[PDB]
Design a protein around this ligand. Structure first.
Ligand SMILES: Nc1cccc2c1CN(CCCN1CCOCC1)CC2
Length: 150
């Protein structure tokens, strides 16, 4: 009973989280996941500022009201070669990664490891934060509040 959460550097407080390295987070689970990081889904303006500080990914993820990919460099296989905050327009499906926003993070690029999930609640799941450098932090808990997500 295990969940890996792969996390990025923060840029103006915004970061990306993949669950088990596959698109697998619903919109309700995304909100709950950010809440466990004492974070919220980013607004578009928060994401645009993060972009301006150096944030880009090659993965779709939830922000408050849309599913997006922040892009700095044009890449054919990431967001159809777009730059800027690319907004997903047409999709059949409902499960993506998520972005999260932590107001207490540093203002620009913070590529230090994440070593806590401060607002997880009591539960039976081994939750492991996995940083890009491989650094790992594990705890027993839960973050999902909707039955449909579990
Ligand atoms: N941030 C982080 C922390 C721990 C593990 C991983 C990550 C980020 N993941 C990025 C996947 C991006 N793919 C998109 C295009 O296909 C190859 C890489 C790859 C796995």
């Amino acid at each position: 009973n295990q969940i890996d959460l792969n996390v990025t550097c923060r840029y103006a407080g915004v970061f990306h989280v993949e669950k088990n390295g596959r698109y697998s987070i619903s919109r309700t689970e995304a909100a709950d996941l950010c809440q466990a990081f004492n974070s919220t889904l980013p607004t578009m303006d928060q994401m645009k500022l993060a972009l301006s500080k150096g944030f880009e990914t090659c993965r779709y993820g939830f922000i408050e009201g849309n599913v997006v990919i922040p892009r700095i460099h044009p890449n054919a296989i990431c967001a159809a070669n777009h730059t800027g905050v690319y907004i997903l327009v047409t999709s059949n499906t409902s499960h993506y990664d998520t972005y999260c926003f932590n107001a207490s993070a540093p203002p620009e690029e913070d590529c230090t490891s994440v070593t806590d999930l401060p607002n997880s609640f009591d539960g039976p799941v081994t939750i492991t934060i996995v940083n890009r450098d491989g650094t790992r932090y594990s705890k027993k808990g839960e973050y999902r509040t909707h039955q449909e997500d579990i």
